[PDB]
Amino acid sequence: SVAGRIVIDDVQPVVSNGRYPAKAVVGEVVPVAATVWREGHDAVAATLVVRYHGTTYPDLADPPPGVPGPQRLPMSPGHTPDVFHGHFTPDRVGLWTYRVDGWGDPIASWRHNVTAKLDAGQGESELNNDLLVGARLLERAATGVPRELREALLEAAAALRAPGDPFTRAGAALSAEVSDLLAEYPLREFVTRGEQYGVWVDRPEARFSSWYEMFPRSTGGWDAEGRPVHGTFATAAEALPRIARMGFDVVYLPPIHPIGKVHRKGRNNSVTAAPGDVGSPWAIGSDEGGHDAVHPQLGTIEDFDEFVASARDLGLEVALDLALQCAPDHPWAREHPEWFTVLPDGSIAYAENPPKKYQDIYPLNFDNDPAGIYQEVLRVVRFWISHGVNIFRVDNPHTKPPNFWAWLIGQIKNENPDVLFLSEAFTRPARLYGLAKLGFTQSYTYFTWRTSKWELTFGQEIAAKADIARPNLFVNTPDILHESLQHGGPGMFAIRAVLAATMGPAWGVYSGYELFENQPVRPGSEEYLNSEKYELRPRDFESALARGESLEPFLTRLNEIRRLHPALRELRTIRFHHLAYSKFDPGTGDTVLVVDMPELGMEPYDRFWVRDEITGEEYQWGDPAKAVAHVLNMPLIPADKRLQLLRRE
């Protein structure tokens, strides 16, 4: 939004007036729309300049006191008065930013004038005041294309000058030949420098990703006496072949450092512990270790290393729990008293947030000693990225200053701008949409409570915020046991597993969803029966599968269909017809329909063939015990078309 010879107002996308960049993935068509206007009645034109600016990361929030701080592209008019649409697709990861240029254009105003005046029936008599400019028109259009290919200016400018037939004098200048040269090197007149707006372009996984959630402690199993055994790192390097098949490319883990021993929480949501209890993983800090130190019962820091490589050459990506939540036997509760919400006595208050309380933890303080805390925390993350961490699962980020978030995001991404984020928060949209703005790559949504087709109409809200926020559709996580699942039965698994895959290009699953687990601790609760974040929950996938009651063969099918269709990496394409929804593809063209024709690209009457991936049923268009769903390859739309409903306005 600037002022000038050409006025360029309302140029999408720009986030919070530019205090942040828009967020994209590489190889994704990104549209930028723009109303622009002028005076009189003469033709107006524009440009979409896109250049790459490396990997250096801009600091988007002002840090606290001690702590530290070209391709010209085209824009085709739409069907909305004075708004324009161009489209760029970034190939490299790193800093990219779009700037819109505005220039009035004459080649086309007289080239139209020629059209109108002779189909209205006029000769050479009336108009030659109008074309003697045309040779003088093409006289500097000449200055704007090379000397060797000047000879081919002179002819038509002469094929305008010398006396000939109305049709003969113009025909030279109308040809594609003459048309070819000014679609490539045009005469740009009266240019207004637009404002240079930004878009940071991440990896794809950052948008098309298959997430999982598993406990490695839980990989312990059963002993000769039939008790649940603790799982260690080695125990877990065996567990992935299973997961790696299903389709996931990134595997998140609950925190993997020592759990404290005091205020520790017992089995079934207890504060009373029993002899040999594991407790809450998210309550970090026993004596023998902290946030960078491993839990003695999963191994050591080196045996950890053997573990992630196992993901390296399987095709999977560890996504660690980065929790800022200490147990009172922490190596900092004594070490650093500073970073706490001290009570005047000398004690630090148990972390509480209503109405769910946690004795077994204490909540950190940056307003106490911001300078001290902040750095340690990166010296912990820096620890991990080296270990081969390219995703960090961030817990309670609305409890932790966004400033802080934005300052770090910088520091890591300034070093390696390849490690990607997920904000797993469910909160006020004014707060909720606020984080990723600051730079959180990905996001958690309130997908859970939203059940109605008129709620899922979620979809309308989500697609519109594709420019910034990126949500992850975890169909399940440890903390809330959604009642639908508990009542819709083994069928309700499929369907909630179907929005999340089809609606969410990046989505998530917690171990056990496959096993149809639906029992809570008590009636009406959405807490899991005998929670794994209070217990070890070894489970037999072989059985359910072998006994032919697993979701495994189907969620690979689901993941198979996802990688099969490039439309399902993308957010903005989503359409909602009459739950039944469609998504189209920009590059390949690929449309799919998951069970409004303009979005289909085909005319209102036509008959067409739709092919099944869930089933395998090809049909000509215009039982939950078998297939509860029905996802189809829709007829494609060609390059030129794909980009036209891609139009932001």
Next chain:
Amino acid sequence: SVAGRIVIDDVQPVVSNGRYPAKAVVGEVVPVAATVWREGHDAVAATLVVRYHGTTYPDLADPPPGVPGPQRLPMSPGHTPDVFHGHFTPDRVGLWTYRVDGWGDPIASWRHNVTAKLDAGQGESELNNDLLVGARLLERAATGVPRELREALLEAAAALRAPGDPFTRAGAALSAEVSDLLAEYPLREFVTRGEQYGVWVDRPEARFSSWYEMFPRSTGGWDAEGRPVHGTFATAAEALPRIARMGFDVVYLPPIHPIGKVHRKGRNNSVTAAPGDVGSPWAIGSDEGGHDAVHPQLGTIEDFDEFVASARDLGLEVALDLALQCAPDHPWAREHPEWFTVLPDGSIAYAENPPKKYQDIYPLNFDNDPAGIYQEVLRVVRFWISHGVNIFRVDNPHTKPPNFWAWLIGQIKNENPDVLFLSEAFTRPARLYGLAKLGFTQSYTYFTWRTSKWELTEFGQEIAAKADIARPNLFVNTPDILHESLQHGGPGMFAIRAVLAATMGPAWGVYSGYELFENQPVRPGSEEYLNSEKYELRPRDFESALARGESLEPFLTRLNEIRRLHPALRELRTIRFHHVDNDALLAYSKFDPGTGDTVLVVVTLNPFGAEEATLWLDMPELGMEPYDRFWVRDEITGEEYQWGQANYVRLDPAKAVAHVLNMPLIPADKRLQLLRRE
């Protein structure tokens, strides 16, 4: 929208990202929104740092190469989560600027839970540390209030420090006494000052104004033979008393300069003229004069100045029409060839804009010689303001590079920012609204094109929404303008269309001839005036029409009276619409922030017979509860009624064509709550 410990996002109003400032009049309440949030759970609050710096005008557009170039107040939260609502009201003319400040407050977030927890029934046992922060809570703010008045601090901090009963120990810090200690002088902890976006304040006349439009030639009158005779400056100064009463304070006039003699247009829009036809005033430039010259058949310019005085001490304000062109007999058409789009022969092609052809005028060229042009045109206007011309109506600015405008307007308002302009544009909103942004004070709206009960709203829906930028000037009629509606509706639809412009538009207008009811076109279906004064001279006997008791002047003075009587009819954004169960009716209400004044107008779409109806109010915007009865009096007619929310209302257009009544007023706390953007 910036970043920090407190995040202040989506701070309304902001113009093209601030590439233009927001727009205001004096003594007007402006609401300001800003979502702000943070992390975790404890209460946060906010502040609106507001400045006046004077009248220096920011150039909002990058000009061409050669051409030259406090009081801390609060944000009261609303009812949309993390959005807050304050409102500041400017007393001076010139540029003002807004900054949103956000700071966490530990005090009020702390005192809440004592309540929730003492209402959970617990004693001093449980709470006795939680209040041990409380004494060292306000001991900061003790540091944040004066030494003479800590005396009123140390007390309650001690009345909690010494051990006693929780309620008596707590009751102290709760009292209103201290509350004001916290309501005026707070502890802003960890505060972030937002982006200072700006707001320019014109004189009030700039939005609450009554416009009227007359031709000077036509008041010339007749000779012993009774044919239309020419008029001078003095002759018209006689017509103003007439005008002076009706209710206007702003009088725009037709070009008063030498119209050309070549290619010029004759009566009834002819391109064929006769010896001595007056023709187009917008056709400037004969031998005897150009943009600076009065036309000789009106006299000369000294004869122009005592006139503006004649108006200025009747309470009215003269505003010439600023059209930008030349008829081929202009003394520049020969002087300077430059500023025209010469065709290669030595000619310049005639200015038209579709579907209208204009032979007798040609288009200046800013893209030939900008440096050469720019200064004259401004050296043209710099001339007239001296005379006491404080308003200029400017013609079709969608025809002239936007560059010039921001520059034009700049330097003038750098000198004197009391002088106001008006945009006569009917272009696409993307352009029409584009104009007022860079700095054109007011706007023409295609309100005319809007006739339906569903247009009469969606027009409103839009205008009221952008009270921050454009100001429509709702002229009931223009020289070029005369609708099928009024031509068919008879004498009644004059009224009804005259109130669509008058009540909805804080600044609205009227063309002369509207009082005497002329509704007739050149030919059937055409929307131009009959025997146009713009090609012919039209003296008129208003005296006749009123004297015999069918002129509208007495109604548009009644209408102009209530306007000056009720402040609900100055604002753009407060406008609201309650529903009616009659297709041919329509009904809307408007309230006041500063005073509280509410006024409501019910009109019909029938310009003929008695067509009755009933009423559906949204009572909250009315400020009244869904259930209650209120005593309502009619001002044009004079009828009191007690109504509820559902109530019966019949009409008859052969008597009184609409229903406009002052509704019961709204209290400070609420009115500000109803301009509240959310």
